[PDB]
Amino acid sequence: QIVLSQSPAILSASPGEKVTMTCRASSSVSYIHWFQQKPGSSPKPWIYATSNLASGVPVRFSGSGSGTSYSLTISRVEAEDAATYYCQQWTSNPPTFGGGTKLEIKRTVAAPSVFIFPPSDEQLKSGTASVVCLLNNFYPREAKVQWKVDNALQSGNSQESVTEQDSKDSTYSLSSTLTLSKADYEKHKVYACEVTHQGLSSPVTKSFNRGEC
Amino acid sequence: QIVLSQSPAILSASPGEKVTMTCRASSSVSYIHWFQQKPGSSPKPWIYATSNLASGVPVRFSGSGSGTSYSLTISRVEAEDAATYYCQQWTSNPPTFGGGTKLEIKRTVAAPSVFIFPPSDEQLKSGTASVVCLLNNFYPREAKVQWKVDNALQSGNSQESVTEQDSKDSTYSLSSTLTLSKADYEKHKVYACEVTHQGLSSPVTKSFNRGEC
Amino acid sequence: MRESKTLGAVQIMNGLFHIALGGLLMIPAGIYAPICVTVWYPLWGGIMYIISGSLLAAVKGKMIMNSLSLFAAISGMILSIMDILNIKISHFLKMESLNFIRAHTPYINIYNCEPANPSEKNSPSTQYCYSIQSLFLGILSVMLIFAFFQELVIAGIVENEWKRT
Amino acid sequence: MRESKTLGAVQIMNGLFHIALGGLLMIPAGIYAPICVTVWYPLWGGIMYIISGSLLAAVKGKMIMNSLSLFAAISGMILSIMDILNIKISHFLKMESLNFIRAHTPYINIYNCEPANPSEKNSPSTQYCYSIQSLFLGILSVMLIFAFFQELVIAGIVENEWKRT
Amino acid sequence: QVQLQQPGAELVKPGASVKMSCKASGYTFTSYNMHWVKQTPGRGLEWIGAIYPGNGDTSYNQKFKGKATLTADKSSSTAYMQLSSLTSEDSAVYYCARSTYYGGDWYFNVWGAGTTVTVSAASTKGPSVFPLAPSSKSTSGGTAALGCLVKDYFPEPVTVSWNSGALTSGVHTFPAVLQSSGLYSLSSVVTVPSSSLGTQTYICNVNHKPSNTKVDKKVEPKSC
Amino acid sequence: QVQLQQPGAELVKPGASVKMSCKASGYTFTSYNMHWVKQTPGRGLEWIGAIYPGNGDTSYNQKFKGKATLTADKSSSTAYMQLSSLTSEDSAVYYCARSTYYGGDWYFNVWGAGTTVTVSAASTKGPSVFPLAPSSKSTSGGTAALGCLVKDYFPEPVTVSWNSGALTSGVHTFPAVLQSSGLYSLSSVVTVPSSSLGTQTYICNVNHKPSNTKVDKKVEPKSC
């Protein structure tokens, strides 16, 4: 039982940048191991016994540390290095992993291409209404949607979903889905999603009246 | 520092015989390992952690034991099983091996074909004399030569050398070499080697007078 | 009781043996100490039994020190009970060892000795861990019975202190 | 000295400390014991200090028991010196532990704790071995100083025994 | 060579139990400890426990010691973990991993692909595919987005393509969201030149192999 | 694949020193302990010590702690052992062996071929090949033995064949014996039908590659 604390939680690194991530153990441990995980795959072993690279790990990586303080550093991040890195310890039963550090490819800020879709008649013919707000190809990863209905602020009844980082553009895309009954959609008229992002000088919105096509 | 005692020192086993050899530790040990060595090669790993056969070890072998008492047993000895088997322990620094057990192929007793060679003139032309007694294709491994010179018993001045077990006949051959100066050989006249073996009803001898060809 | 010479000497000996068991229990043994060590009970409790050995030298100043030594015996008997339970039922008080003692044992713990790899249950490494845990359980229970010894003798004095005064 | 009450009580406490340190030093710790444990010195030496606490009850029968307790203190002080050297300079007296104690620790030794595999010098397994060795060195040296305590007090009695008689 | 094979997914009812497996290959199965590791997005990687298949010894994380039950078969060379009394909080990826001792410490040097366990009362409903019909509402900068809402299906892997695979540039398919109905929903979208919305009849293709369901929908500003 | 390569033999003067080597290949040299083991017929297998090439830590058998000195080069991936102050009692086969941890204990799972060290003042004399001329003295049961005494050579590997290799059945070549002269001697013999001693001119062929010496001798009852 030892807690492994990783910093930062997200590391954004521009291609070729030297970067370091740290693992801090609530008690001193003989060694730390590092694993790389990419979404949809199991954690690959990456560094073992503090500093030994696993088979096929690019010598671009190195690891160091002792006692309670350990780190993994990349002399230059490649685009392929984008992953979550987990430290792990064996010094106490049970063995424990860190929370991970997500490595992100840092790029030039890009404004979200905001779009909104009404609930189409096909869905109203099912008694249900879902309003989709779309933010294409924005960066950074942060953003927030706001849902407004006759200017009243919605809450709770919207689910947020995000792509992973585009492995070519390195932007993100996000969609937000307000959901309503048919009778709820058919009460109010003016539906808006409001978007705040560092790629914008201000809040922005896309909106529609219900009834107009 | 733990002494590993193996028994027997020589195990003679007929092809197909089930046999067992034991290793006894002067103190209890977590596991015993067994190695097979054939002359002129390094010790092959054979059994590890008391009972696990090494890669390619015939399931003909098995190992068992605990604490201070361990054994290796062969359900049927093959002719290829003839080797020295060493137990080994890791439970105490330094790790220690046993004395080994030589596995021998047991066969029908055979009398030694005794022969004797005078020092030839080529060697007397070098001032030196060596008398060679030869015991071809005897079994068992035990034998003793006796050297007699005008019936006087020689001692010390003879070296004994033995083949390994013939991998086809499974007999042994032995040669004994009495050595003398030219002046010592040219004093006494009657040279004999006397052979005692379980393949004989009695002592036997081969001998020569010096001067006769 | 009247036996103030005999009883005072017993207290000094209980104090010296608490100090010895304390320093012994401070021999580096890993990430976590007993509460007894972390509170320094065998040091400050130990010298308090030496001081109430003041009744070897025959004022209510002695009542103050006897009462403090009685409080020390009670708290030591509670603290050593707690550490035995802390070792054997659950590590409910995780008293981090003094870091100059951890410097020699930074990677070991005796409040758990099951290995995460089951092959190692047979291992000498595991048997060493249970040996230290058993020694600590022994030292703590030796310290408990001598802490309980003090409580008896001091109570049998403070009883006469108040019934005299 | 005249203080026969005070000194006899000190001896009983020294005896109880030896018995406690002895049973503590018999907690399973591997193939080899200290000579103190193998000779059972803390048991038979311990009760001899309890018995020479007979001078709490005020004949040359006491001279016999005092002399035996003096011999016990001397031999205990020599035996605990030997075991400290046995641990720290060379394992020159390999006193095999009683087999009912070895049953719990059949695969470990504390008279050597260097691993044969140098990668393991960093290992927790190695740190556990040195922890037990340090505890034994501590218990033996605590037992030495209380054995030396007995020798002083008994000699300061047997001196008065012969100069009285 | 050295490889651990796991069933890729398990669907199990609440309160029920599951016995997932880990087929070892390419190494002496009995000579290594086999470990099980849970992963959940809210808790990271939790070690569950291990079995040594040689004898059969197990050890467990205390926060699992009655949830999991490890087993191994020496003959098929397979480790098993049984989870009892399953709840939402047991929905996770479960990896088997083989620990070697190497470089002076233990080391998870090979991992299974992981088994995704979903603990759900729900049943294999197929997707209600609704067109996100594009408009000036979805027009900006002269591009327009258009999409399909692959709504209210159950077992998570739907697949979506556009124009039968002929459209891939500018497509995004979002991760599915589990709704309070216990049914998954997903959106897929593409951005195109807004003038193309007139002539090009963009088609989204949906497949849900668990319900064996194929759907295609026309997505254009010819409905609202 | 995994392999430890050693020089097969070393000849060294007394009091001198030798630095034998162990070239690792096919595995991560720095991730395993490398051990050295002595073998002598009178003492069996003595473990000498080990080095961990990762850092450089060593441990030694106490009965060797000033005789051996272990070293490793991370770059050539080679372990070394240096023996000082060499004596007759240092003549041995020396194996390097790599220990893994496997099945719950340490395990010498791969070994070098071994280096035979001979500590000798002597010098590379070639063999005095004397014929063991056969006679009724060497006749029994109607067979006769005949042989060659390959006497007083030094470095141990002579090779002996008969009739340039055309005779092999019934041949024995004995292990060489080290004499009090410090020179090795060896005998080789063959048993043949005694009548063949008349016509067949049996030849023993001797080679001593250390002294680059080739010898052949006629062995027949035409001298005594």
Short mmCIF file of C-alpha atoms in Angstrom, two decimals, chain B residues 19-144:
data_model
loop_
_atom_site.label_atom_id
_atom_site.label_comp_id
_atom_site.label_asym_id
_atom_site.label_seq_id
_atom_site.Cartn_x
_atom_site.Cartn_y
_atom_site.Cartn_z
CA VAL B 19 17.19 -46.06 -9.77
CA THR B 20 17.34 -43.22 -7.27
CA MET B 21 20.13 -40.97 -6.03
CA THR B 22 19.83 -38.81 -2.93
CA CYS B 23 21.17 -35.45 -1.81
CA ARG B 24 21.28 -34.61 1.90
CA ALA B 25 21.84 -31.07 3.12
CA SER B 26 23.60 -30.33 6.40
CA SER B 27 20.77 -27.86 6.96
CA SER B 28 17.29 -27.55 5.51
CA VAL B 29 17.09 -25.76 2.16
CA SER B 30 14.14 -24.32 0.25
CA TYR B 31 14.97 -26.18 -2.97
CA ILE B 32 17.60 -28.34 -4.60
CA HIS B 33 18.75 -28.06 -8.20
CA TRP B 34 20.31 -30.89 -10.19
CA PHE B 35 22.88 -30.64 -12.97
CA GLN B 36 24.03 -33.33 -15.37
CA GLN B 37 27.67 -33.27 -16.46
CA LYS B 38 29.27 -35.52 -19.07
CA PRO B 39 33.07 -35.40 -19.30
CA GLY B 40 34.45 -32.53 -21.35
CA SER B 41 31.27 -30.43 -21.15
CA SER B 42 29.87 -27.90 -18.73
CA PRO B 43 27.15 -28.95 -16.26
CA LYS B 44 23.81 -28.90 -18.02
CA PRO B 45 20.86 -27.75 -15.90
CA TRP B 46 18.68 -30.79 -15.37
CA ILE B 47 16.20 -30.18 -12.54
CA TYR B 48 15.40 -26.82 -10.98
CA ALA B 49 13.45 -25.96 -7.84
CA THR B 50 13.34 -29.57 -6.59
CA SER B 51 11.11 -31.01 -9.29
CA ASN B 52 10.86 -28.97 -12.51
CA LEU B 53 12.64 -30.60 -15.44
CA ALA B 54 14.85 -28.30 -17.48
CA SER B 55 14.12 -27.72 -21.16
CA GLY B 56 14.60 -30.97 -23.06
CA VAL B 57 15.22 -33.16 -20.02
CA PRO B 58 13.43 -36.47 -20.68
CA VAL B 59 10.33 -36.94 -18.53
CA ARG B 60 12.12 -40.20 -17.75
CA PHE B 61 13.68 -38.15 -14.94
CA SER B 62 11.97 -36.78 -11.87
CA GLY B 63 13.05 -35.06 -8.70
CA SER B 64 11.54 -34.84 -5.25
CA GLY B 65 12.28 -33.98 -1.65
CA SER B 66 12.04 -31.34 1.05
CA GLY B 67 13.97 -29.82 3.91
CA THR B 68 17.22 -31.75 4.28
CA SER B 69 16.43 -34.77 2.07
CA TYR B 70 16.10 -34.70 -1.71
CA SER B 71 16.36 -37.22 -4.50
CA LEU B 72 16.55 -37.64 -8.25
CA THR B 73 15.09 -40.82 -9.71
CA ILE B 74 15.04 -42.30 -13.21
CA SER B 75 12.06 -44.48 -14.11
CA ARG B 76 14.32 -46.40 -16.53
CA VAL B 77 17.98 -45.58 -17.15
CA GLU B 78 18.97 -45.16 -20.78
CA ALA B 79 22.55 -45.66 -21.90
CA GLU B 80 22.64 -41.89 -22.54
CA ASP B 81 21.88 -41.25 -18.85
CA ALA B 82 25.44 -42.22 -17.85
CA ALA B 83 26.81 -39.01 -16.32
CA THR B 84 27.64 -37.31 -13.04
CA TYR B 85 24.68 -35.60 -11.36
CA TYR B 86 25.34 -32.67 -9.01
CA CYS B 87 22.83 -31.29 -6.57
CA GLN B 88 23.11 -27.59 -5.75
CA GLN B 89 21.58 -25.18 -3.24
CA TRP B 90 20.94 -21.43 -3.18
CA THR B 91 19.44 -21.19 0.31
CA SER B 92 22.70 -19.99 1.88
CA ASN B 93 25.47 -17.75 0.65
CA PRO B 94 27.77 -19.15 -0.80
CA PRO B 95 25.77 -21.53 -2.98
CA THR B 96 27.24 -25.01 -2.88
CA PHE B 97 27.23 -28.12 -5.04
CA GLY B 98 27.22 -31.73 -3.96
CA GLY B 99 30.06 -34.11 -4.60
CA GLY B 100 28.14 -35.64 -7.50
CA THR B 101 26.85 -39.12 -8.22
CA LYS B 102 28.40 -40.89 -11.20
CA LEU B 103 25.77 -43.00 -12.95
CA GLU B 104 27.37 -46.09 -14.50
CA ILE B 105 25.81 -48.60 -16.91
CA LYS B 106 25.85 -51.97 -15.12
CA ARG B 107 26.70 -54.96 -17.32
CA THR B 108 27.80 -58.58 -17.19
CA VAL B 109 31.16 -58.97 -15.42
CA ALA B 110 34.11 -59.35 -17.82
CA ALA B 111 37.66 -60.46 -17.07
CA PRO B 112 40.51 -58.06 -17.97
CA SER B 113 42.48 -59.01 -21.06
CA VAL B 114 45.84 -58.52 -19.32
CA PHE B 115 48.91 -57.59 -21.38
CA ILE B 116 52.40 -56.30 -20.58
CA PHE B 117 54.90 -54.34 -22.69
CA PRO B 118 58.65 -54.10 -22.00
CA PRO B 119 60.48 -50.80 -22.26
CA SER B 120 61.47 -50.85 -25.91
CA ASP B 121 64.98 -50.07 -27.13
CA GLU B 122 63.81 -46.66 -28.41
CA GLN B 123 63.22 -45.65 -24.79
CA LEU B 124 66.43 -47.22 -23.47
CA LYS B 125 68.19 -45.18 -26.16
CA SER B 126 66.73 -42.24 -24.19
CA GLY B 127 68.08 -43.50 -20.86
CA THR B 128 64.55 -44.11 -19.60
CA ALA B 129 62.38 -47.19 -19.12
CA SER B 130 58.61 -47.47 -18.75
CA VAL B 131 56.74 -50.77 -18.34
CA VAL B 132 53.10 -50.73 -19.44
CA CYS B 133 50.51 -53.18 -18.12
CA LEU B 134 47.18 -53.22 -19.96
CA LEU B 135 43.76 -54.49 -18.82
CA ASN B 136 41.40 -54.39 -21.80
CA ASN B 137 37.61 -54.46 -21.61
CA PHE B 138 37.08 -55.40 -17.98
CA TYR B 139 34.03 -54.79 -15.81
CA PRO B 140 33.37 -53.75 -13.00
CA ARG B 141 35.16 -50.43 -12.69
CA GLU B 142 37.18 -51.68 -9.73
CA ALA B 143 40.53 -53.35 -10.35
CA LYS B 144 44.00 -53.24 -8.90
#
